Amino acid sequence: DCGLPPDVPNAQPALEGRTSFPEDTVITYKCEESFVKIPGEKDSVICLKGSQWSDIEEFCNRSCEVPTRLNSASLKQPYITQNYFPVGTVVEYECRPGYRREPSLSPKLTCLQNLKWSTAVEFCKKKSCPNPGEIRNGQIDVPGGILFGATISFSCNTGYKLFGSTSSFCLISGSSVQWSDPLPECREIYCPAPPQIDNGIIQGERDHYGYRQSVTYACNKGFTMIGEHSIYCTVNNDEGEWSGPPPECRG
Template sequence: MRRAWLLLRLLGGLAALLAAAARAAVGCGVPTRLSFAELRNEYKNQNNFSVEETAKYTCRSGYRRDPQLQPVITCLENGSWSKALEFCKKKSCGHPGEPENGRVIVTDIHFGSTVNFTCEEGHRLIGQPYRRCEISSTRVAWSGDVPICERIPCLPPPDIPNGRHTG
């Protein structure tokens, strides 16, 4: 009886070792590619990560780090990466400006967005009818300038043979 008990313990220990080795062998491949962040340099050439190992990211240009969230993902036991929280948020360009005698149509003022301009009736748009929130040097800024809404001049009245204009 004692021999059977020792054999069962030995087999149980062996099974635990094999399970641990299988978990370690699983690992994860290349970390998830993110639109808002890129892998830090020390992880860019690494193709295999062990279970519970983390990969760290830095925010891409046009994004800023959310201080509430850690910029990491973790290799899980099943060989997949943990879900990447949105730890980098788009930077804001602020208000794009508004032309006199016109208006700006704004749906978003963050990196990558575009706003459009229109003029009031009787005015025409001079310049680009849109601005885009983009990278300018090391910061985000609106492209181009606020367009001008120029008053459309009235044409002189046509000549009327044998008649005249009133008013």
């Protein structure tokens, strides 16, 4: 049997709590922090006859950790599966979903001498959603732009009622940015048909009476009006309600 394996710089043998290794027993060394094993180089020893471990030279070199995860871009091949980032190494990035390349900026990163990657630029910008558009008799609230991940709400002008979603999200869709919900509709809140009064009539009657619109009453010959001569259509909670009671035609 062999005793503990030799000592190797920047590496620590995985003994597994043992002290005595039977012949042929193979022991591998694991590099230390800031150190990654050179590809193709021996990183192991074997206990041979004569209680003699195999030969071995230094096999670890200085390197950067795996590039940090970015929300905008994702590593390309084959860097996406590498771990040995010797100084002076460049990794290439590819815009995520859904982000778009910024021509003027490099999507590559460099492993600096201090085992740190070059501060990443904004090579991958956020994809812009299509213009929310215009809502007839309604409004679009764009709290913070229309970029991917954005949010817009909808409301209706007084007198109109909202029919559909109250909000939309610039969610990721296929190979581009798209709004989660369709542009709703604002429906005119019509009041109930104006009451018909006795001995009177409605001056220039109408088909539909909307918000603020009024109905004017008139008494027939020989009759006298009793009350407010007109009423205006009010709206309360998408509910159309007449200003009040129609006048009265007293004979």
